[PDB]
Amino acid sequence: GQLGGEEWTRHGSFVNKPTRGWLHPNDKVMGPGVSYLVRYMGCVEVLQSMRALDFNTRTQVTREAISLVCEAVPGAKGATRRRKPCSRPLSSILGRSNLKFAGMPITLTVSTSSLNLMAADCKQIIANHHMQSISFASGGDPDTAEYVAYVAKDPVNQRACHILECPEGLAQDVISTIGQAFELRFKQYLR
């Protein structure tokens, strides 16, 4: 079945030009992939879209979001505990975050337009086939003292936002600062 393939890796490099991707180079993602022990934190259901703070709600939202996931699963203990709602951000943003698979320490791996996780505590591998992998993050400065958030398009057009927590290693890339695995600009499939 099928005609032709592309699962080989014995070709030369580029003509003669440098570059920088996730963590450091581009090949680091298209070959070995960045993998470390990161605690996968529940997702945060957001409702915001147009009527928000002021043509922006990255920090604001992500702030209450992170605190949200923690509210449901205080086991991690970071901002709240047991139960205790707080004010902010401003405007009608966010709706509710689900702890579905929160505070779970596993070995995550980031690849060029492909994120594959590996249950380090559950003793198995975690897969994901919803979309490429990433697109637009929160950035933060900081996101929340020592917290990290991820975006999840599903439905598409900014809907859900997963949560993460890394003490060191991947926290540098996820947080967004040093390079980033490019080759994807709303076109996907390297089209």
UniProtKB/Swiss-Prot annotation:
It comes from the Eukaryota. Phosphorylated by activated epidermal growth factor receptor. Phosphorylated in response to FLT4 and KIT signaling. Isoform p46Shc and isoform p52Shc are phosphorylated on tyrosine residues of the Pro-rich domain. Tyrosine phosphorylated in response to FLT3 signaling. Tyrosine phosphorylated by activated PTK2B/PYK2. Tyrosine phosphorylated by ligand-activated ALK. Tyrosine phosphorylated by ligand-activated PDGFRB. Tyrosine phosphorylated by TEK/TIE2. Disulfide bonds: none annotated. Widely expressed. Expressed in neural stem cells but absent in mature neurons. Signal peptide: none annotated. The modification Phosphoserine is found at residue 13. Residues 30-191 form the PID domain. The modification N6-acetyllysine is found at residue 28. It is found in: Cytoplasm; Cell junction, Focal adhesion. Interacts with CPNE3; this interaction may mediate the binding of CPNE3 with ERBB2. Interacts with the NPXY motif of tyrosine-phosphorylated IGF1R and INSR in vitro via the PID domain. Once activated, binds to GRB2. Interacts with tyrosine-phosphorylated CD3T and DDR2. Interacts with the N-terminal region of SH2B2. Interacts with phosphorylated LRP1 and IRS4. Interacts with INPP5D/SHIP1 and INPPL1/SHIP2. Interacts with TRIM31. Interacts with PTPN6/SHP (tyrosine phosphorylated). Identified in a complex containing FGFR4, NCAM1, CDH2, PLCG1, FRS2, SRC, SHC1, GAP43 and CTT. (Microbial infection) Interacts with herpes simplex virus 1 UL46. In response to a variety of growth factors, isoform p46Shc and isoform p52Shc bind to phosphorylated Trk receptors through their phosphotyrosine binding (PID) and/or SH2 domains. The PID and SH2 domains bind to specific phosphorylated tyrosine residues in the Asn-Pro-Xaa-Tyr(P) motif of the Trk receptors. Isoform p46Shc and isoform p52Shc are in turn phosphorylated on three tyrosine residues within the extended proline-rich domain. These phosphotyrosines act as docking site for GRB2 and thereby are involved in Ras activation. Signaling adapter that couples activated growth factor receptors to signaling pathways. Participates in a signaling cascade initiated by activated KIT and KITLG/SCF. Isoform p46Shc and isoform p52Shc, once phosphorylated, couple activated receptor tyrosine kinases to Ras via the recruitment of the GRB2/SOS complex and are implicated in the cytoplasmic propagation of mitogenic signals. Isoform p46Shc and isoform p52Shc may thus function as initiators of the Ras signaling cascade in various non-neuronal systems. This is SHC-transforming protein 1. The gene is SHC1.
